[PDB]
From Swiss-Prot:
The modification N-acetylalanine is found at residue 1. Belongs to the aldo/keto reductase family. Transmembrane segments: none annotated. It catalyses: an alditol + NADP(+) = an aldose + NADPH + H(+); all-trans-retinol + NADP(+) = all-trans-retinal + NADPH + H(+); 9-cis-retinol + NADP(+) = 9-cis-retinal + NADPH + H(+); 13-cis-retinol + NADP(+) = 13-cis-retinal + NADPH + H(+). SUPFAM superfamilies: NAD(P)-linked oxidoreductase. Disulfide bonds: none annotated. GO terms for molecular function: aldose reductase (NADPH) activity; all-trans-retinol dehydrogenase (NADP+) activity; allyl-alcohol dehydrogenase activity; electron transfer activity; glyceraldehyde oxidoreductase activity; glycerol dehydrogenase (NADP+) activity; L-glucuronate reductase activity; prostaglandin H2 endoperoxidase reductase activity. The record marks 77 as: Lowers pKa of active site Tyr. Cys-298 may regulate the kinetic and inhibition properties of the enzyme, but does not participate in catalysis. Tolrestat inhibits retinal reduction. This is Aldo-keto reductase family 1 member B1. It comes from Homo sapiens. GO terms for cellular component: cytosol; extracellular exosome; extracellular space; mitochondrion; nucleoplasm.
Amino acid sequence: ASRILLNNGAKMPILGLGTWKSPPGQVTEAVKVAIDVGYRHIDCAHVYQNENEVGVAIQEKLREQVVKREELFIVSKLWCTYHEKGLVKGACQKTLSDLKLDYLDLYLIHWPTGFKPGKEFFPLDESGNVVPSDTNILDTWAAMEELVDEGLVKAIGISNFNHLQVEMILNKPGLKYKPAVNQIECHPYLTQEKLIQYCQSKGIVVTAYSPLGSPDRPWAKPEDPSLLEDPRIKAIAAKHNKTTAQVLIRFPMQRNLVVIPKSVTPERIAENFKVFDFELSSQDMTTLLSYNRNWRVCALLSCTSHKDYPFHEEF
Ligand SMILES: NC(=O)c1ccc[n+]([C@@H]2O[C@H](COP(=O)([O-])OP(=O)(O)OC[C@H]3O[C@@H](n4cnc5c(N)ncnc54)[C@H](OP(=O)(O)O)[C@@H]3O)[C@@H](O)[C@H]2O)c1
Ligand SMILES: O=C(O)Cc1nn(Cc2nc3cc(C(F)(F)F)ccc3s2)c(=O)c2ccccc12
C-alpha cells in the first residue's frame, strides 16, 4: 500500500522525495517531475536553504490542478537554532511562507540538540565546538504541540532522537500529542533494529533517511563503504531485474518504514518511484540486514559534546 496510518489519524505516503543538497536552481524542476510521476510526499528543511524553490514547484502543480493540496504530504523540520519556545512559531511560519503553504502535514524537531540562536546555523566557539542553547527537548516539544493547536501543522514528530530521548517525550509530564514520526538514518549499513522496534511498538512511524548512503554528502571519503557499489546488493538487484537503488528503497518499505530518497535527476526520480511492482523475499530482507556495520552519514564531529548528542547511547 502507498500510505501508512499515523497516530494523528492521517495517512503518510511511504515514498517521499528528499531535498537535502538539491541545488536551488534544479530542485524546482525536480519536484515538478516528481509530482508528475507519482510522488505525493516531499521532505524539506529550512536548513537545506531551498524551501523557496521547492515551494515554487508545489504551487505550480497546485495551480495547474495536477494535484490537490489534500493529496500532498509536505514535511519540514525546525532547525537547532530555533529550539527556544519564543522562536518556534516564527521558524515554522518562515518555512510555510517559503513553501507557499498554509499548513505542513508534518513538522519535525530536526535534531534533539538546541544551538545558540542567531543567523549562523552552526554557531561555533573559537575551537570549533558547537555552541549549545540551554533549551531542553521537553519545552521544545510543548512548543511543537502549540503549532498543532494553532493549525499551522497537522502532525509533529522528531528526528535523530535515540530511544531514551523518544522515551523522554513519551514520559513527558502533561504530554498532549505523541510524536507521529521519528526520522532517522537507516540503510543496510545502519539497520537500526532496536530503535525501529521501540518506535513501532509505541505506534511511532519511522522514516528512513539517506537510504542510498548519501553519495553526494559533502564529507564523503574514499575509504567509506558504498551501498550503491556493494556487489552483494548489486547481486540481489540483478536477481530481481531492478537497480541497486530500487532494492535499497524497497528494503525499508518492507520493514514498514517511510523512505525518502533524494535526487535532482529526472530519470532517477522516476526510477526511484518504480518500487511498488516487485518484492524482496524474507531471505533477501534478512540478508540485507546482515550488512549492518553501524556506519553513519550524519553525525557531525563539532556537535559531539552537546549534552543531548544522541549517538553515544547504544540506541
Ligand atoms: N532528518 C535529517 O537529519 C536528515 C538527514 C539526512 C537526510 N535527510 C533527508 O533524507 C533525504 C535523502 O538522504 P540523502 O540526501 O542524504 O541521500 P540519499 O537519498 O541516500 O542519496 C542521494 C544521492 O543519491 C543519488 N541518487 C539518487 N537516486 C539514484 C539512483 N536511482 N541511482 C544512483 N544514484 C542515485 C543522488 O544523485 P542525484 O541527485 O545527482 O540524482 C544523490 O547523490 C535528504 O535529501 C533529506 O530530505 C534527513
Ligand atoms: O540535517 C540534515 O538533515 C542533514 C545534515 N546533516 N549534517 C550532519 C549533521 N550532524 C548533526 C548532529 C547533530 C547532533 F544532534 F548530533 F548534535 C546535530 C546536527 C547535525 S547536522 C550537516 O552538517 C548538515 C549541514 C547542512 C545541512 C544539512 C546537514
